[PDB]
Amino acid sequence: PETHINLKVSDGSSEIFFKIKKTTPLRRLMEAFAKRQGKEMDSLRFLYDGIRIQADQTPEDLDMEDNDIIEAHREQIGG
């Protein structure tokens, strides 16, 4: 009954793979990515398969899959 999931976070020309438990909020994972880009985590909108996600939620909330991708984008309400 697999407990961990491998996810990728990408912003175009840079990516980072992470392993985390299905039940763990994406917070740390987002902050980690934001750190290595030298950016405010509020500076970034995070998409999963077109869905806008917030640090409060877990892979199982979003019903994520092994090798799923989170895309990180700049700020806009557009956008």
Binding site: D49, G50, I51, E60, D61, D63, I69, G78, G79
Partner: protein, 256 residues
């Protein structure tokens, strides 16, 4: 020698109903690893591609590859001859003129055996390599079916247009126009209703509603539909089976 006994007799009928309104004469090629079928419609803007892998069968046997040319109108008729609790087996020898369709009840009280004459069908020049696509979505097939049925009343043309978090469907015609906008979402309670979108490039394509109206008939085969769109190739509408798929490749219309 071909012998293929279906897991569920009703499945084959469901498959054929899936695409008998697109093309009527198709060659089914049986090989040692399953059945495939490909056909282009008369206007040559639509390619149907079928794969039924070995795991769809209770029992499967194909010694040497055979080609079964069938009129799907005839086939459809014979397929009506099947009780839901019945077993369906396809039987053909090597270089056949006939496919046998053999329906059986557990008790073996009622044995229905149909023998369909095969046809000579030209199936040539079927090019198939899917360039990477600009965008991939998936959604419930009934939702998509409803969107297409609705918009097709306004116009012979449906535009699909994809942007960062948005899928927009648009038909514009004599009486007026309609847009359906949908948003990717997940509902972790009932996950089968989700809408998921991978957009590398934004895309904007128009399709003939008459063809979409046929493609949506794939809804009897699966809950979800995958749509792959690119600005420079035919679009892919895919319905998965357990061990296979029904694909429809559709040329976009030209931007006049």
């Amino acid at each position: 020698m071909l012998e293929a006994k279906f897991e569920e007799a009703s499945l084959f009928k469901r498959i054929i109903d899936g695409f008998k309104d697109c093309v009527q004469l198709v060659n089914f090629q049986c090989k040692e690893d399953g059945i495939i079928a490909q056909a282009v419609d008369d206007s040559r803007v639509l390619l149907v591609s079928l794969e039924i892998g070995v795991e769809a069968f209770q029992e499967y046997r194909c010694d040497h590859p055979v080609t079964l040319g069938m009129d799907l109108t005839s086939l459809s008729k014979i397929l009506r001859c099947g009780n839901n609790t019945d077993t369906l087996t396809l039987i053909a020898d090597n270089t056949p003129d006939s496919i046998i369709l053999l329906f059986e009840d557990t008790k073996k009280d009622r044995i229905a055996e149909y023998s369909l004459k095969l046809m000579d069908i030209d199936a040539d020049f079927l090019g198939i390599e899917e360039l990477q696509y600009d965008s991939t979505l998936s959604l419930p097939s009934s939702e998509f079916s409803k969107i297409v049925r609705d918009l097709s009343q306004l116009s012979d043309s449906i535009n699909i247009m994809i942007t960062k978090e948005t899928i927009k469907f648009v038909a514009d015609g004599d009486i007026g126009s309609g847009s359906v906008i949908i948003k990717p979402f997940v509902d972790m309670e009932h996950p089968e209703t989700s809408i998921k979108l991978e957009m590398d490039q934004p895309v904007d394509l128009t399709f003939g509603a008459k063809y979409l109206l046929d493609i949506i008939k794939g809804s009897s085969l699966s809950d979800r539909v995958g749509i792959r769109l690119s600005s420079e190739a035919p679009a892919l509408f895919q319905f998965d089976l357990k061990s296979g798929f029904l694909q429809f490749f559709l040329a976009p219309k030209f931007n006049d």
